[PDB]
Design a protein around this ligand. Structure first.
Ligand code: ADP
Ligand code: ADP
Ligand code: ADP
Ligand code: MG
Ligand code: MG
Ligand code: MG
Lengths: 372, 370, 372
């Protein structure tokens, strides 16, 4: 009778809702904003902190902080504020009568999961909770059991291969390059045309420009030559103060760091090379079934050129007698949450929760013996 | 309707007595999971038997219950027999007498535990145990001759005169297709290919079944392979990679004629056959030389009959006629001979029934059975 | 007076010197470093590549490559640079007056040995060269003639049984699990405490941590229990930037992969089981002398718990009436080189060289005729 809750706490967005539904009920940014200027009018309900869309609307007088960086919760009072906001104000529920399913990136610190368990059991005390891997939930939402998931969000980009319900944890790859790094690189290369975005409020403007105007080039050198020849690739964007800026090659130089990390000084290889190395680290008899089942999930995989570029690069890397298929659904921005809405709804899952009695018996160390 | 089951070291060939071909031919492997299961909307078993193992071997560790002809694991043999009776044949073992096969020169406790398991767990009205090379001679339409039975675990040379095997001339060589698969895995490291896992052992087995052959003259074949690339052949891996082998095609089966390639003390199959013939009386040696019968899958290399003819002609006296019979269906020849034997009229009183097992115990198979 | 050179080209280190000496004169890493950034100051040297210790000195601005992976040379131009820096910079000799002795792991590709012979004879042109197995040189240095040698370095762990100078080829076993895989596994499991190491320069730091702090437990489960029970097995290490890390139970989980290869996803058996299988593939009358003369060589056999653990495991596998003695010399990090100098200083080895005229007559295939 008790309805389970599915909460996906990424680095940039919080997607929370109920199990068994199709879409998340509450999608809001994971920001806590605090005032930085001098308040002069008395009273009028001035608050010392702002969470979510209220922090985004008043961001001209606020300093915005993200509690999670690179998939790791760095500030815990702000994370308590985020969880209190998504339980009492957005979802409008009482957490003492709802089990909770949370998500986590692979190769994370164990103390993050231990403190998530301790805070969910001692502050918002739940009957049950469970922490799950996001790529497994993406594979649940895809409707299949075999595939290699490339999940790229705001802090982490990770590859997880799964064959017939069995994961290969030695081939799991994690890269700390995601949409916030692309936002910072776009902020850096916007100064070549004279545009200066420095403050934490203007990072959101640069993120909006990246979401609206950036795309992935199929050929990088041909697109650079096309931009250098004619002004057919230039687009205009209107700033909130009415200013109009114009960008050319910076539309496709920004997500190219996903394929050339050396643009931001990283020594690692691209996401296509990471996916190929994750496939080639698996057993030989499963690789074919991986090659036809490349699944992309997350916001950073939402550029309108990325599936064709990934297919071209993997087809260049793979032998020619193999079929390479990139699976990009239109709902892949929320796919992890949809997997939670599947996984908490299964009758075979209800014995996998971590109850309060088990937490009192074992402490906050049962989350490693219970969750993978 | 009787049941004929050939439980080889590498394959299981089972069917009904009277049919001309086996109905269930599947690998004798048990696969178990190796990695961490993360999805709960799945069947999620713990043991896979047969082709279901071969369709899932990339996440599985494979085990053979039979090693070098003798049964090492009896729980896995129970699983093999259960899958044979209930999933591949769709029969009830309470209604059908079952014929079983056994390699010659084997420990007696293997037959003891075979009869005990077949009468206590998979209860049959009757059962019988037969020698494989005798059935392979029976399937070829003759009653006198020498059978070279080479399979997955053992190679045997059995001479049979007037339907009776001669036990003082039965020769056993502990070299068969599993050792050839492992030797091919060892010698593919020279060209840079690494095969370690039990799943890749099946890939190398497929390579051996597809590309290898027997050279007529080994030194001349090695000379021609080192002169030009006219013997190189290509194979496409399951992941799309292309490998090329030039002289491993004939070096791997040469262990049948030179067993020291894998470090075994015994002589080759030609000397083994000549020794098995030469232990017999002089008046039957002409019939044994004229009736050489090949059997099993390891005799399916496309050069083995001519090479065996050349070597036995070299060993034998020059006035002796050497004829080697290699039937095209010799991969299924123990089963066909068992089908012929189980469909005979007078064989029906040679069944070991359950009442005689109750009155005797797990030792009747050494008195009523051979 | 043409003294011979003994050069051991491992996967991680190069140990080179003169025959007759008791210690290698040049021990340096087998790396080539190339710049990953741009040079803004002019008037310097600024060479395009760095070999050996100079690559390790400025590894923060270089990406590092190993020309030898799992005992097999993959990059041959980098191996040209390594051998040139060995002959002309670390030894200061001209390799036209010294015959050379090289080492190779067993069950290697034939093209590696053919190309080594070719590059020795018409690039660094030598009067003579020989290629020898490493484990027989370890037994030559150990002073015995019968026994089974476990050589474990940076790329290949191999077991070779030798009876009265006869290497037994059908019981030689090879595993591609060595110290580099251990370094990668420690790099992976260091992310549980939050320590993230990504670049190729940080792999050297993790290798230094492994060399300083890791050890082999006698009983793994009791060690895990006492690590979880008390904070008495923790140790601290200082990074180059001054930060301090602490590891408690990663010290014995990292070399547990040598005994449980399933930690990195491999299906193979442990080194103790490989040793027992190598002994069981020998003749039945020589297994007593092989069980009494177990010799450990290489750098991965330098953990300070490995001899007692190997003794316990082999005594478990062996029959109860057998005597098991495992010999670990204190100088076993350089044991292939010492036996190589012993072999090259012998009077009856002077007919076993491959001369230049023989290479001219027979081409680069006489190394399969004159060398084992
Ligand atoms: N259409 C789009 N094009 C490019 N980037 C996008 C798009 N939509 C969202 N993003 C990026 O995705 C990132 C977060 O995606 P998501 O994975 O849904 O959140 P989280 O990482 O918090 O789970 C943001 O940094 C945002 O810039
Ligand atoms: N075309 C072929 N060429 C060479 N060997 C083969 C061929 N087909 C099958 N084999 C070998 O025959 C062996 C098994 O044959 P068979 O005797 O029918 O089974 P079992 O040995 O279990 O009785 C396998 O190990 C396989 O390697
Ligand atoms: N004291 C030690 N403890 C643990 N590992 C060590 C120790 N000393 C060396 N090693 C490891 O041994 C490896 C190389 O050893 P060695 O066999 O001497 O070189 P190579 O493998 O190049 O021949 C290095 O990767 C290093 O990590
Ligand atoms: Mg996310
Ligand atoms: Mg058979
Ligand atoms: Mg070495």
């Amino acid at each position: 009778e008790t309805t389970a809750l599915v909460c996906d706490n990424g680095s940039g967005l919080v997607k929370a809702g109920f199990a068994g539904d199709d879409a998340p009920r509450a999608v809001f940014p994971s920001i806590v904003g605090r005032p930085r200027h001098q308040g002069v009018m008395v009273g009028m309900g001035q608050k010392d902190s702002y969470v979510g869309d209220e922090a985004q609307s008043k961001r001209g007088i606020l300093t915005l902080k993200y509690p999670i960086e690179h998939g790791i919760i760095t500030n815990w009072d702000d994370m308590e504020k985020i969880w209190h906001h998504t339980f009492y104000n957005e979802l409008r529920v009482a957490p003492e009568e709802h089990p909770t399913l949370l998500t986590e990136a692979p190769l994370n610190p164990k103390a993050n999961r231990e403190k998530m368990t301790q805070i969910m059991f001692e502050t918002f005390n739940v009957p049950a909770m469970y922490v799950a891997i996001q790529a497994v939930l993406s594979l649940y939402a895809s409707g299949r059991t075999t595939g290699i998931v490339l999940d790229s969000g705001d802090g982490v980009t990770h590859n997880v291969p799964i064959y017939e319900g069995y994961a290969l944890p030695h081939a799991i790859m994690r890269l700390d390059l995601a949409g916030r790094d692309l936002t910072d690189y776009l902020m850096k290369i916007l100064t070549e045309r004279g545009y200066s975005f420095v403050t934490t409020a203007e990072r959101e403007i640069v993120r909006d420009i990246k979401e609206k105007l950036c795309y992935v080039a199929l050929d990088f050198e041909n697109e650079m030559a096309t931009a250098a020849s004619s002004s057919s690739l230039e687009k205009s964007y209107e700033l909130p103060d009415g200013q109009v800026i114009t960008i050319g090659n910076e539309r496709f130089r920004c997500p190219e760091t996903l394929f050339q990390p050396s643009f931001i000084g990283m020594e690692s290889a691209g996401i296509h090379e990471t996916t190929y190395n994750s496939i080639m680290k698996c057993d030989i008899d499963i690789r074919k079934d991986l090659y036809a089942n490349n699944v992309m999930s997350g916001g950073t995989t939402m550029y309108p050129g990325i599936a064709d570029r990934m297919q071209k690069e993997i087809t260049a890397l793979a032998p020619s007698t193999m079929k390479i298929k990139i699976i990009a659904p239109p709902e892949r921005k929320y796919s992890v949450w949809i997997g939670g809405s599947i996984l908490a709804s299964l009758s075979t899952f209800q014995q996998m929760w971590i109850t309060k009695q088990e937490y009192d018996e074992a402490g906050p160390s049962i989350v490693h013996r219970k969750c993978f």
